[PDB]
Amino acid sequence: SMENLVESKHHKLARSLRSGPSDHDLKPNAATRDQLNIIVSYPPTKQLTYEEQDLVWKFRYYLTNQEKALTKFLKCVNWDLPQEAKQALELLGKWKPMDVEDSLELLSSHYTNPTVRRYAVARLRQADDEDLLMYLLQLVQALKYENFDDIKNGLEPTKKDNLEQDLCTFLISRACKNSTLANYLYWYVIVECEDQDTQQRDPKTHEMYLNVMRRFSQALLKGDKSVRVMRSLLAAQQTFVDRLVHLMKAVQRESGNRKKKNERLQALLGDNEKMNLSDVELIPLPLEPQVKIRGIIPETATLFKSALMPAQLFFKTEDGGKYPVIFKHGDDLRQDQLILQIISLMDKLLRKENLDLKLTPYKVLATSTKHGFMQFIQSVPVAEVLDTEGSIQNFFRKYAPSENGPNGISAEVMDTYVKSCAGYCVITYILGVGDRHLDNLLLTKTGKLFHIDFGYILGRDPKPLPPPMKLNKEMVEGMGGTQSEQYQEFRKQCYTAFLHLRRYSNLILNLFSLMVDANIPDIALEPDKTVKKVQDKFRLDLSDEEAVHYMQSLIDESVHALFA
C-alpha cells in the first residue's frame, strides 16, 4: 500500500519526464516560444505544471539567456538525484545573473540545497543598508534556518573557546559594516532571545539559538577594535533600561488614582529617574542610534492611564534637546512592531513611486527580557476635536486660518490631507484593519492624518467591521461639499496609485512568502486562503480600472450608507 505500489508510480512518472529532457544544449525553435514568453511572465504565485515543468527541462538556452527567468525553472526542479544536482550546479554558473529580488524566493525551505543558498547570496551580493529596511519582515524567513544552526554549531562555538559560502560571515560582512545594523538589530534580536525558553522547551533549537547569539557576539567582539568593544558597551548601558523597567514594574504596583500614581511616578522618577538618566554616558535613543541621552526631566513626565502602562516622557539628550519618548512594559508588543515595520517597507516602495501617505511610522524596539520602547506621539485622537470645532471646515479655519474654512485657501494643509487620505484608503484595502471608531481618529490640525487601530487585522471584528476604504459620515459633511474638488482629487490620486503598485509589488509576494512565517495570532488556519485572498482582493488576475469603478460605486454606497 505505502509499499512498492507507491514507488512504482514514481518510477513511471520519473521515466519519460526524466531521461528525456536535459541533453546537448541548443536554442528553442518554434513561435510557441513567443507564446511561452508570455506564459513564463506569469507572477510568483503562478505555480508550475506536471508538463510545463518538462518544457523548461527542454528549453534551457532561452532560460539561460533571460537572466531573471531562471527562478521559474528553479521552482520546477528539486535536487532529487545527483544527476539532477550535476546539471543544476552546472547551469547555476551558466545562467545570466539572477535578480537580487528573485534571490529572496530561493532562500525558502523549498530548496534545502546549500549550493543554491551560497549562490543566492551572490545574486543578491549588495552589502548595503537596504538590509535595514529588509529587517522590517525578514525574521519569519530567518525562522526557516534552524537546521544549519546545528551544522555551524560544530564551528562557531568551537573556534574561540567577499566571496564566501558562510551565511554567518555574509551576515557579519554586511551587518557589522554599520553600527545601526549591529546594535539595533541585536535589540531586535533581543525580542527573539525573549521567550527563547519555549523554543528550547518545545523545539530545543532555541538553546542552539542562544549559542548562536552568544557566538555572533563572540564573532563581533573578537573583531577587536575600539568599534567592537564600544558596541558591546552601548548594549550594556542600554541594558540598564531593563533595571529601570523592573523598577517601573514596582512603581506600577504602587498604584492609586490616576493623580496618585502620577505623583508616585513623578517623585520616584524625580530621585531615581533623574539620577539614572543624568548618570548614563551617551547610550542611544529608541528613535535613533545617533541621538544619545544625557538626562531625563521627571517634571513633565506623565502616563497613559491604562493597564498597558504606556509612558509619556522627555529626555535631555547629549544633543541638548529634550526628546519625547514612550515605553510599554509587561506586554509582548510583537504584533505592532511587525505591523509598523511592514508599513515602513510599503512606505519605502510607495515613496519610490513619489506618493507620501503622511502617516507616522513611530519607531519600536526591545532592549532585553520582553521590555520595550518606542517614539512618542502628539495627537488629536477623536471626533470630539472636530465637534469642539464648528465643522470639518471650521476645524481647519480655527487652527490654520489660511484655510479659513471654505472662505480661505489652505494650500499644503489641504494638499497633505488629500494625498494622505488617498494613501490611507489604500492601506485599509490591503491590511483589512479592524475595530475602527470615531475615537480612533487622530486628526493632526497641520494636515497629517492618523487613523490608528492596526492591531486588529485580517478583518478581526465580531461581524460588521470597518470598510476597505477610509471614510465616515463626519467626513461626508466636508467631502460632500468639496465633492467637485477634493473627492475628485482623492479619486484621481488613488486611481493612479494602485496602478503603480500593480507594477512592482511582485517582490512583496516573495517577501510575504517568507514574512508569513511569523507569530501573528490564529495563523494556524489562515495561510493558503490568505495568499489566494491577497491576489484576488487586489484582483491582479484582472488589471481592469473598472474594478476602481466598482470600488467608486461602493464609495457612492458609503455616502448612501444610512440607506445602503
Partner: protein, 588 residues
C-alpha cells in the same frame, strides 16, 4: 508517549496535518497518529469544549449501525470509539488523497471505463446508505480516498482540510483555497440554501458570510434529511469530474435559486443523453422534478454494465474480506479467476490475444490495474506463478496500456534481484512484451529501453542468471522491433510533414542517419558488454573463471543478434580469435 512531535498531543503521533473553518459549519483539523507505530490520518477533536452538547451518543450509534457494514464505502477501524477529553480523535487510516486530487494526480490512470467504474462503485454506496437509511447527507471530494483496489471508499466527513487538485500537466497558478466559500469548493443544495439556510444549524434569523440570508430558519425548525438533498450535492461533485473543474459561481447559485442556470457543457459524453439527462434531472429542481439513483441504475447507458458491476461486486466483497490475508488471495485468486476469466471475457485456453481484432469480446479492462495495485504488496513467490500466468494471459492492454502497466515489472526484477532467478521470470514476460506487436505512441518510448535495459544489465553483472542472457540475443531482434515500432512513429512523424545538380532528398533521410548513428551507439554499448562477456569466458578474478563456458550454450541463440554488430569483423574476429587460441588449448 504523551507528547510526540507536538506539545499538543496526548499519545505517540507522527505529525500535525491541515486545519479549516466552514461557512456552513465550524472549525475542523486532521492528525497523523503513529498508533502501534502505524502513522494514520485520524479526525481531530477536543472533548473538553464539546462536553456541553455530547449529543454524539446518537451519532456514535448511527456510526455503529453504519460501520457494521464493510461494503464499497469506508468503515472506520475505530472512529466512534476514539472520543476522549483532551483528545476525541476519531480513528481512521493514513487518508489525505481526496478525490479530484487523486484524479489530477494520475491522468495516466484517468480512462473511459475507469471513470465510469469509479462512479459506479460510488453509486452502489449511495443506493446502499439510502436503504440502510442515513438520508440527506452532504458531498464533496473531502468525502473520499482511493484504495489499492481502486475502490471509492466513501466516508461521512465532507470537509477534508487536506484537499485540492494534484499532478496537473498544464499550470502556472497561485493557491486556490476558499474558492467559492469560507472553505473548499462545495456542492450546493437548492432546498437548504435557496429555501431555508445553507447552514446546518438552528436559529430564527438570516446571516450572510455563513449563510441564512434566504430565510429566518423557518422560525426555529430542524434539519430534514431527504434523498432529494443528496441528489443535489452529488450533482455538483459530478460536473467537477467532467469539466476537470467545478461549477461553483455566485451567478450560477442565483441562477440555481431561479432553478435555471448558465451551462457550457464541456464534454460530448456528458452532454451525451446517457449522462446529460440524469444530470439535468438533478439540475431542474431536485424536489420539484425527479432524479432517482434507481432510475439512473435501471437506465444504465449500457444495462450490461450494472450487471458487470454487481456480478463482480461479489469478488469485491471478497476483496473487503481480503484485508485479512493478501498472499492467500494472490494464489487462490489465480485458481478462482481462471474461472473469473472463463466467466468474463472468456478465452477457451486462458491466453487472450492482446489485439483480438476490434476486440471480439470487447475488452478494455481497467480492473487488471485495480488488482495489479493490490498485488504489488510483498508477501510470497506465489506471485511468480500468477505473473507468468499473466504473461501467458496476454490480455488486450494496448501498447501504451501495457506500457502504463510496465511500471512495476522491472521494478520487481529490481525489488527481488535478491532471488537471482526472478531474472528468469522477468525474461519470459519481457520476451512476451517484445513478441506482442503494437504501435509506439511517442518517439521517446523506445529510448527508455535504451536506458532501462542498461541499468538492468548492470544488475546482470551483480549476478549472472544465465537464462535471461540466453534470451537476450533473440529478443535483440525484438528490441530492434522496438526500434521498428519507433520507426512507426517515424511513419507518423512523416504523417506530420503534410541528382547531378545536388538534390535535396538527403534532408528526408538525414535525421534517420543520425538516429541510426544513435542506434549504432546502441550496437556499440552491446559490443562493449559483449566484448567484456567475450573476454569473460568466466567471470574473471584472481586467475579464476566463474565458468562462462556457458557462452557455448548461449552461442546458438546468439546468431540472431550476431547479424547486428558483425561488420567490424576485424574487431569481432580478433576477440573471437583470442577465444579460439585459448579454447584450442584448454577446451574439449
Amino acid at each position: 508517549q504523551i507528547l510526540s512531535v507536538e506539545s499538543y498531543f496526548s499519545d505517540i503521533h507522527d505529525f500535525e496535518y491541515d486545519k479549516s473553518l466552514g461557512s456552513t459549519r465550524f472549525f475542523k483539523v486532521a492528525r497523523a497518529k503513529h498508533r502501534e507505530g502505524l502513522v494514520v490520518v485520524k479526525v481531530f477533536a477536543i472533548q473538553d469544549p464539546t462536553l456541553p452538547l455530547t449529543s454524539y451518543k446518537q451519532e456514535l450509534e448511527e456510526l455503529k449501525i453504519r460501520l457494521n457494514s464493510a461494503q464499497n464505502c469506508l468503515p472506520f477501524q475505530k472512529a466512534s470509539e476514539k472520543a476522549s477529553e483532551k483528545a476525541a480523535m476519531l480513528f481512521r487510516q493514513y487518508v489525505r488523497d481526496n478525490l479530484y486530487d487523486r484524479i489530477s494526480t494520475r491522468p495516466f490512470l484517468n480512462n473511459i471505463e475507469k471513470r465510469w467504474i469509479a462512479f459506479q462503485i460510488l453509486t452502489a454506496v449511495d443506493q446502499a446508505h439510502k436503504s440502510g437509511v442515513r438520508h440527506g447527507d452532504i458531498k464533496t471530494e473531502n468525502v473520499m480516498v482511493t484504495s489499492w483496489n481502486w475502490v471509492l471508499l466513501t466516508d461521512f466527513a465532507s470537509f477534508k482540510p487536506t484537499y485540492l487538485p494534484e499532478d496537473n500537466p498544464a499550470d502556472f497558478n497561485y493557491f486556490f483555497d476558499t474558492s467559492r466559500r469560507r472553505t473548499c469548493y462545495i456542492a450546493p443544495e437548492r432546498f437548504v440554501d435557496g429555501g431555508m439556510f445553507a447552514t446546518e444549524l438552528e436559529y430564527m434569523r438570516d446571516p450572510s458570510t455563513p449563510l441564512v440570508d434566504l430565510n429566518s430558519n423557518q422560525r426555529t425548525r430542524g434539519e430534514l434529511k431527504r434523498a432529494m438533498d443528496i441528489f443535489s450535492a452529488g450533482c455538483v461533485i459530478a460536473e467537477l469530474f467532467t469539466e476537470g473543474v467545478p461549477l461553483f459561481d455566485l451567478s450560477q447559485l442565483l441562477a440555481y435559486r431561479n432553478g435555471h442556470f448558465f451551462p457550457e457543457q464541456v464534454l460530448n459524453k456528458i452532454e451525451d443523453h446517457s449522462i446529460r439527462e440524469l444530470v439535468t434531472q438533478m439540475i431542474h429542481r431536485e424536489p420539484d422534478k425527479r432524479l432517482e439513483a434507481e432510475d439512473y441504475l435501471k437506465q444504465q447507458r449500457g444495462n450490461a454494465f450494472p450487471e458487470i458491476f454487481y456480478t463482480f461486486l461479489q469478488p469485491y466483497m471478497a476483496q473487503f474480506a481480503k484485508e485479512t490475508f493478501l498472499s492467500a488471495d494472490e494464489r487462490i485468486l489465480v485458481i478462482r479467476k481462471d474461472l473469473g476469466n472463463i466467466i468474463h471475457n472468456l478465452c477457451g485456453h486462458d491466453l487472450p490475444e492482446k489485439a483480438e481484432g476490434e476486440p471480439k469480446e470487447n475488452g478494455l479492462v481497467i480492473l487488471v490495474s485495480v488488482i495489479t495495485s493490490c498485488l504489488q504488496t510483498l508477501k510470497y513467490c506465489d506471485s511468480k506463478l500468477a505473473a507468468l500466468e499473466l504473461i501467458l494471459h496476454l490480455a488486450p492492454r494496448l501498447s501504451v496500456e501495457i506500457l502504463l502497466d510496465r511500471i512495476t515489472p522491472y521494478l520487481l526484477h529490481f525489488s527481488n534481484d535478491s532471488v537471482p532467478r526472478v531474472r528468469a521470470e522477468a525474461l519470459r514476460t519481457l520476451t512476451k512484451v517484445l513478441a506482442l506487436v503494437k504501435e509506439v505512441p511517442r518517439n521517446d518510448i523506445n529510448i527508455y529501453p535504451e536506458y532501462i535495459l542498461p541499468g538492468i544489465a548492470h544488475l546482470a553483472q551483480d549476478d549472472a542468471t544465465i537464462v535471461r542472457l540466453a534470451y537476450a540475443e533473440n529478443i535483440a531482434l525484438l528490441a530492434e522491433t522496438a526500434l521498428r515500432f519507433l520507426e512507426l512513429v517515424q511513419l507518423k512523424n512523416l504523417n506530420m510533414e503534410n541528382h547531378p545538380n545536388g538534390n535535396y532528398d538527403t534532408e528526408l533521410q538525414a535525421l534517420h542517419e543520425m538516429v541510426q548513428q544513435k542506434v549504432v551507439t546502441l550496437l556499440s554499448d552491446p559490443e562493449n558488454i559483449v566484448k567484456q562477456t567475450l573476454m569473460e569466458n568466466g567471470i574473471t578474478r584472481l586467475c579464476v573463471f566463474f565458468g562462462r563456458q556457458k557462452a557455448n550454450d548461449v552461442l546458438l541463440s546468439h546468431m540472431i543478434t550476431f547479424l547486428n554488430d558483425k561488420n567490424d569483423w576485424h574487431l569481432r574476429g580478433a576477440f573471437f580469435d583470442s577465444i579460439v587460441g585459448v579454447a584450442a588449448y584448454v577446451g574439449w
